[PDB]
Design a protein around this ligand. Structure first.
Ligand SMILES: O=C(c1ccc(O)cc1)c1c(-c2ccc(O)cc2)sc2cc(O)ccc12
Ligand SMILES: O=C(c1ccc(O)cc1)c1c(-c2ccc(O)cc2)sc2cc(O)ccc12
Lengths: 154, 154
């Protein structure tokens, strides 16, 4: 049991490292790090519902879009956390790049991120990214509402 | 070395458990789970800067406020992750309760959270919570902006 868990954790860590360092044209093949039915996407959005991309085929299609709308994206300040589950990792990092969304002015987007990676048989079964959407709003020129703080201790 | 790390991780996990299960009036003593100079707070806000509460005395004062403004708050769906660092844990959970913020209508707030816990000498040195502020906006009746999706693949 321990031997199998140690082997899984060490292999899965290398896949997380590879995913987090993938940039440029290599993004077009990042979906090969997933199971055929693997899921990826953004869990923190304006609607409160995740934008989940389901299946290795749709993940590869999404990468094409990502190359147009986040053309130079880089993950920085990467810290990878193994867990007691050899098949579950967390990553704390930052990300940065141009944001080129349809019908918005071109912007520069910087944010802090957390990623969750769950594995099955050596590949990613579920990737999820979590951020503060207010920073993406700012990068797009969208007004961010402000909670009134007058009544709060400061 | 291994023995010291295992002991630290086992003790620190009990403190994370205790923190996540602290409810009601016991919140008034939750700051005793921190070092004297410990820091806690909310890393995801409308401004993009953390609201960090610095020092055990200020943490204790914030709990008084928390009891009025989140009077029945509970953390649910708690999943605690140990890491390769015996002094660093992550928690995935949900939270819910009434929200009674000054100058806003009383509401109901539900959100998904990630917590980071870093330890020093058996107590919490740094706690950070991460959420999607859009859900807190909704709970307060604040309009949430919407990214236009027409040009995005759906
Ligand atoms: O930035 C993204 C994003 C990034 C990565 C990902 O895995 C999924 C979504 C957002 C959107 C989007 C939807 C469909 C697409 O085809 C492309 C983009 S809509 C939206 C709305 C937000 O409030 C914040 C982010 C995004
Ligand atoms: O809900 C919180 C909060 C909760 C826990 C915590 O540890 C720190 C802040 C928010 C605020 C706040 C500031 C000072 C206080 O004295 C009390 C509250 S301002 C604000 C603004 C937001 O966009 C979202 C949440 C909050």
């Amino acid at each position: 049991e321990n031997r199998a868990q140690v082997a899984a954790r060490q292999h899965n860590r290398k896949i997380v490292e590879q995913y987090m360092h993938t940039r440029g044209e290599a993004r077009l093949k990042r979906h090969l790090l997933f199971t055929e039915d693997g899921v990826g996407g953004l869990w923190t959005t304006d609607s409160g519902q995740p934008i989940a991309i389901r299946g290795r085929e749709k993940l590869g299609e999404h990468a094409v879009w990502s190359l147009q709308c986040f053309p130079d994206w880089v993950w920085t300040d990467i810290q990878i956390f193994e867990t007691q589950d050899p098949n579950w990792f967390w990553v704390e990092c930052r990300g940065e790049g141009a944001i080129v969304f349809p019908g918005y002015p071109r912007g520069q987007y910087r944010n802090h991120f957390l990623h969750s990676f769950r594995f099955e048989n050596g590949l990613i079964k579920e990737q999820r990214e979590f951020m503060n959407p207010c920073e993406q709003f700012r990068s797009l020129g969208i007004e961010v509402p402000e909670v009134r703080r007058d009544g709060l201790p400061s």
